[model samples]
Target: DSRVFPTQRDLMAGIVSKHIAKNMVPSFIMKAHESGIIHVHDIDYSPALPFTNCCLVDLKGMLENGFKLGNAQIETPKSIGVATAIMAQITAQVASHQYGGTTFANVDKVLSPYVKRTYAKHIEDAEKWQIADALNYAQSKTEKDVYDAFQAYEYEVNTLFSSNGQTPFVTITFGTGTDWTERMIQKAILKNRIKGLGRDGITPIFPKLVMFVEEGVNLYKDDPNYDIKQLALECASKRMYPDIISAKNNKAITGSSVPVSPMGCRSFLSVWKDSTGNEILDGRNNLGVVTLNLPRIALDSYIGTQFNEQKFVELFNERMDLCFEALMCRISSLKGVKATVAPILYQEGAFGVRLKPDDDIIELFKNGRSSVSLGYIGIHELNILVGRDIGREILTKMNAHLKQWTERTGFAFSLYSTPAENLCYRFCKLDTEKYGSVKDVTDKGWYTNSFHVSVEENITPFEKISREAPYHFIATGGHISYVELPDMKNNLKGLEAVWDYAAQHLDYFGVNMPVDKCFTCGSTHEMTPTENGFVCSICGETDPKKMNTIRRTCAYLGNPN
Candidate 1:
């Protein structure tokens, strides 16, 4: 009976599951909510009788929701394991959506085959704790009550599920914001941890409300001081989800100190449950098995019996709370990307310098008899393929730069930022021998990438093309001229940053270009949902995987007309 195990492994396992579950769940739910394919309620409750408010109420109710699941028989161990499995799958969907647009979807398509193999490694660990360790803890009547208290704690996260509000803002906070330095979150996007998201990105929302509660109970070991033990219980009552995104003015974003609460210590114990009975807790058993390599023992019981409704809710709250914590760090730490606004003035700046469209494709370059041959692919087409994020980013930077230049001097020329005309079929067909017949996975299918040289006939020749691959051509007398980068890589990067930024504000351009217009083929094929993707019937192109690669490359190294 006194077979003792090292405590370190148990803690590590708990942290790992906690960490992965926290990051992935929000990501999955958010993506599903945004994509229009699935709803938030579908994620919160059972898919069969999805109307059931299973995820609502406190921790106790969530764990005890007697909704039968696949292979999750009514056993103590199986129950918890099923919960963990459900949580994991939910997180995976979020993970897949984190990359947002097409990249995440494409990678999943290629790698989805191995997902089971990858999941199998953690299955045993999840199963071990669910069946053996948690059961042991629940067996003790006092311990059961301690864990059951989580049911009483109410963490209201109902607002995020509602679509009546504007673009949803999400945020989180942990530590004093002093101990947790944000060096990484400031500069680079959290690409590795946050994958499966599309280009239309989200910034962490500002926290208008802050609540700080002491740590709660330590169910793991018998505590002497009970100071930290009290804090855990207190944290249970500090509900932080509602205050973050209720009513906002100019959409501010911030993360700061916590709000001190009353009954803080008492609330902590009510929520926090330390891993005392490892022999009966799946979380504890999984923890011990993985980090310590301790032999896992399965108690003779039904797997469904292990998961208590309260425990399930507490786990969810812990995750929801922590996700915001990470988001706060991410948003507060963001740098190298300044988002200050400037007054935009219309002046005699260069045609393509300003973020908005100065003139129609031909008119901008044409004046009286003498006309410049430069043509752009069209703003509408570019936005559709490049997507909102990259397009928006590109525009923001370009607009800022343009406003500064116009205000500083009378008129400034910012160079051809997009390839609206250059990538058009008319330009490509002009040089029939070089690019017309060529069906690149990108330029031909998505955005147009051709040159400008006003020819009397549809088929015209250009005086010069970039002396490199992809065949970029420039017109000496073109109205909209590109600030030709020395290399392809730089050109694409610069263009993408500008375009992504610009796509967000179409009204600024003062042009009405429907999103349906094709950047490449000049066809208006809607993005209808197919088995694989939001596919385009006109070009026979499927979603994100095929679409994103084309978009990224075009945005990255796209040719300007």
Candidate 2:
């Protein structure tokens, strides 16, 4: 659904969604969904349309095999410029077919040979012109061309709107490659990002840049891609992106050295091992998400029962059983979907599948390759209602429950720390209206997201990271832990320290710093939030169009306006 405004198309889709939910979604599931007992994500799509969730498009197959996008027969480009342009087009195509973010996994590695082709062409021309410094000219000119191509690439990603009336939710991942071309790819993208968009140089809101952090690969001075890593930090210092992925923790959980991209924002793919025991992540996606409202469950168990342990556990298991059935409703909905439904995704190289037009898409979702998320929200509130130790135990129990489901069904049933963009408000409002103010449970305007500590908690950044890092291990489907920091443009060293510390303890994490810019007065500073609206610190601008405030939610930056 469109977050800001719904159009006539969205309305038409909503009517269909309600119809499908009534018939396809079990009555008890919809009852829980409507009552906010459990929340289902993307009801507008999912079981209704047989669509998939977030994905990491390999692009290697698509770019190499020369896939057809709609009617056009696209051949592999011989230069970086054409390659990046095709990437933008393919991204828009893939996004229109799916909901949530589309990641170009190891884009640098995939594009390196094309870059070498560009460099080769440059050197050939230089030598033909009798230039003595042909090597230097090829290097410098090829880099300039790549940088310019990236600038064009960034513009295209931000400018194009898919059928959903929004820019495609896309993330590009890199910083693991050691090649010279990979270094240039990281440099061009990060450099252009830090330089910003236009005259105001505002931060962009699409094609989220993610860098994989590994010790000997890109983590230190002795590392192969360390310089590119520094540029990434510098980019975040200004533009507040390039959210990092820890390859160390990735290897720890997947039991493989292969780096996997986050599916959408923080949703990750479980380790899908082949017969040779290699982790295969590319082209796989999250099937769907159904979230259990923990505070809602706790409140149901606690209100009038006076926080009874036996009752809470009984109700929790019952709700979890319902949640499992709800998730299966989503899984089962995709059973007979034909490849012709999303030809570009299933029949094309975007998914590394070449199924016939009417072929069933079941092969893509089987044997723990792709994941379906069992999400939870407001663990902090649950902790307050119950006890802290019991809350942790419940999280452990949820993981075990999912493990059993995975074994029983051969589906990658995974735990999720949902970003809960609107669910936070939906759950809090419904619970507050029914239960009234019950201490931390319904006393607030919104619930804390997933297993996060309360926003008002007094804790150091390191402490917060330490406390939340354990969930990253548990919420293997999609998880992200972050520390909100004041403007760190001038204190990048402090930011890097956070990165270094988090890389050791976390699989995925981010830093949130204000990246506000005054539109009326042309000054960039943190905007002060008031009951009425945000006020520009220097100009007191109140108009929505006059001030630009960028905030990170769901691990993507956007103007709340």
Candidate 3:
């Protein structure tokens, strides 16, 4: 049927020879792809395209480098004009190249210097006015001006930045460790309020915000920023920016003041070593990752009636090794890549290393700073196959094994609870065709995401959250736990209650609220589910175009209407 190779066997061998072996790609990678043991992301290009992977853009670094804004060359933005311009440029650049979202790492601190510069100007002007309460007036005016400017900047980012028919995925991290950046944190939170802007205060879907929740820093009553944390919760209920990350119980990942940095979605950067062997998170990136088909492996290990744990473990290890080899191949293939390909990333040193056009950039990959991830999907199904809920134990054991492997091989190894966008359906479909349907596993068109319990299952929100929270630590690459709720707009306290519980239990958490707005009439309210579809009660706009339902399915919001 195919002309490339006469038989399927030869075709596979050819693929191995050219795509794999030619690039020093591991032999098991092709076998992994054929057997559905792993899905190597972005395998089409001769030298794998790096943009499709996630990147932690050094926004501060880019600003310091002095990028062009419209027509002018500006360095160290001192005002909203230059700052927002730089942000726009960075967001657009990231969206244009990156497949996964980009985060403005330490944005609060990055933008802090600029915010202070702006405030100083306001104070200077206020003193010239000869007002009686000049200091107080200047303080308030500075806060207001900063808030308004950043809000407009948020609108600018949402409006001007986009790629692939969607908003460019961007996130900003704030309130971490010793550098709380309280003033900037306040401004960001104020900008995120739903009622602060015009009527219906539309939530900007870009630049998802991450706020570090420390026990004595932001969460506790005695903390100076406690009020800010409450306001953050209020904003979360309204706009859903500032996804909360726990800094209290996650010391194993990083030290105090340094929160576990997560990508826009769930991809996270693992701790790595520097030139001096000191652990660092700054100025690094994930090379790429290959996600495993865990459910498929579990089903393959299924015996006459029940699943054999021994067989499942054996198959999992084999597939995991294959995934490791494939990821290394991905790194190996990049050894020839020139900095000229992505000048902004490699040449401009947005990822923290300036390189010549011909420099391999392989040393960046070789060092522990960057990582090649081994991701897994459908841990729930794995637990189901094992006939017990050892999900936490399994992941912990896998992390230990990978840690050992990383130490032994000097390769950065980490486990990811993969958010399988389309692979969920593909893995399920392939299994159904080849292995037949298996109850609680491959019977459905889609496998459960990561290690989450089935969405269809009826369980208390607290219980589900409590169960899923532990895996956030194990999913070193990234993980998030969200509890679904129905129209909790009126019950803001309940929302805060859930957030409080989650702040203690989970590493990263969000509450999903079903919110809708009618663009035609600007009537915003909860969408009521009817026999036909979601209905807007205010203007009775049943047409999908007239109604916009903003639902949080994963780490980001989407309009499923």
Error of 1 at 19 (Å): 55
Query: Residue 189 in candidate 2 has what lDDT?
Result: 89
Cα misplacement distance, residue 290 of candidate 1 (Å) = 61
- lDDT by residue for model 3 over 1-561, one digit each (tens)? 344333445345436545644355555567667567778765543233534367777676667676443356557877754576677676776666555667776666677776677767778887788778877876777666566666766766666534344457777777753443345545454555555334546666666777777777777789877777777766776676667777765555544246656665767676665667665564566666688887788788878887887898898777766776777666656656666666667766567677788886666656466655778888788778778887788778778768876787666777877767678887788778877877777877788888888877899889988888878777766778878877665676787678778888878777777667777877657878788878767777788766567787654576764
Model 3 lDDT at residue 76: 83
Better candidate by TM-score, 1 or 2: 2
Clashes of 1: 106
* Clash-forming residue pairs, model 3: 51-99, 177-257, 268-477
Q: The CA-based lDDT of model 1 is what?
A: 0.22
lDDT of 2 by residue, 402-471 (tens): 9999899989888888888778889998888788887767777788888787788888899999988888
lDDT winner, 1 or 3: 3
Question: After best superposition, candidate 3 residue 519: deviation in angstroms?
Answer: 4.5
- Residue 357, candidate 1: Cα error in Å is 24
In model 3, where do residues sit more than 4 Å from their true spots? 1-31, 44-47, 50-52, 64-73, 127-133, 161-166, 177-181, 193-200, 255-257, 276-279, 519-524, 537-539
**Candidate 1 — which residues are off by over 4 angstroms?**
1-182, 191-193, 196-409, 421-553, 556-561
Shift of residue 485 alpha carbon in model 1, Å: 21
Q: Lowest-lDDT window of 10 residues in candidate 2?
A: 1-10
RMSD of each: 30.1, 2.1, 5.8
| Model 1 lDDT tens row, 1-561 | 012233344344435644554454456444422432112221221121101110000112222333222334222223322332333222222212111100000111112222323234345555666755543343343222212221111111111222112111212211111110111111011221111122331111211111121112111135221332233222211111111110011011111122111010000000112235211101000000000000000111113434243543344334333323322222222222211110011011111112232322222111111110111233323333223213233333333543443354322112122323223333333333332342231234333332222221142111111111011111111111122211222133333232222222110000011122233444333345556545565876543434422111222221111
